[PDB]
Design a protein around this ligand. Structure first.
Ligand SMILES: *[B]([O])([O])[C][N]C(=O)C1=C(O[C][C])[C]=[C]C2=C1[C]=[C][C]=[C]2
Ligand SMILES: [K+]
Length: 263
């Protein structure tokens, strides 16, 4: 709905920065609304969903086991690792690491998982192989959140990310079991409350992943829909704002309220 673009444009005004937006029908894959669909933005933590997608793909092929335990040490701990810093002695299973990465956005968990699949190079190869030649991961946590202006490292476009998420969630790349496992991890959340979720009515379904980086970068990817069933994919990114985190959260949530209002 054009009224939603009014809100997206208002966000650019309020934040003094670029905002990328795309809304796709989950069933058909049809593009419903878009704003700067082909401009690059830092993915930030939203890449963690693509990461676990790749992990699940290996699980499907028998190259990995969700129950396999990964041991790590203090040397591996990077900034913001709420779950992993807690299990240094126990180690964590692949399944628990994807849960930590997606529900809490644990950064060390992402690095451990990246290692299991071959690193940023292999995640990019995975995406390229499935038809996405735009999205690219180049670095590890925490550097991949740098968001240097004009830098293409660790970026995607709203359009690239939206279609790739759609392929992972409803395409035939993953088995039904894995597709649901990925959706299940995205439905759980302890950090994206201020974003789309704050505008969502209680009965709605939402599977999402948020991201935050330097230079006011903020974003979220999600599959959502009324009455417990997702029916659309929404991707929103912004970078360059000097606004506070609460201000950025509010603008993204307002885009969500408009999306919901004109559903
Ligand atoms: B992901 O983008 O959520 C990983 N994000 C960060 O590490 C990060 C956060 O979120 C968790 C603390 C907030 C602010 C930041 C971050 C990274 C770089 C600069 C600012
Ligand atoms: K989530």
């Amino acid at each position: 709905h054009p009224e939603t673009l009014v809100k997206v444009k208002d966000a650019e005004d309020q934040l003094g920065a670029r905002v990328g937006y795309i809304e796709l029908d989950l069933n058909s894959g049809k593009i419903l609304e878009s704003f700067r669909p082909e401009e690059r933005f830092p993915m930030m933590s939203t890449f963690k969903v693509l990461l676990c997608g790749a992990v699940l793909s290996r699980v499907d092929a028998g190259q990995e086991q969700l129950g396999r335990r990964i041991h790590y040490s203090q040397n591996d701990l990077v900034e913001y690792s709420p779950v992993t810093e807690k299990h240094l002695t126990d180690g964590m299973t692949v399944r628990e690491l994807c849960s930590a990465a997606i529900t809490m956005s644990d950064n060390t968990a992402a690095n451990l998982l990246l290692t299991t699949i071959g690193g940023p190079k292999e995640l990019t190869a995975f995406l390229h192989n499935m038809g996405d030649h735009v999205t690219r991961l180049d670095r590890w946590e925490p550097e991949l959140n740098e968001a240097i202006p004009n830098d293409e490292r660790d970026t995607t476009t709203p359009a690239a990310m939206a279609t790739t998420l759609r392929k992972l969630l409803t395409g035939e790349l993953l088995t039904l079991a894995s597709r649901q496992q990925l959706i299940d991890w995205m439905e759980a959340d302890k950090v994206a409350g201020p974003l789309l979720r704050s505008a969502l009515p209680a009965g709605w379904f939402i599977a999402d992943k948020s991201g935050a980086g330097e230079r006011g970068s903020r974003g979220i990817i999600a599959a959502l829909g009324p009455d417990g069933k997702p029916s659309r994919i929404v991707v929103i990114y912004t970078t360059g704002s000097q606004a506070t985190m609460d201000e950025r959260n509010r603008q993204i949530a307002e885009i969500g309220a408009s999306l919901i209002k004109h559903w």
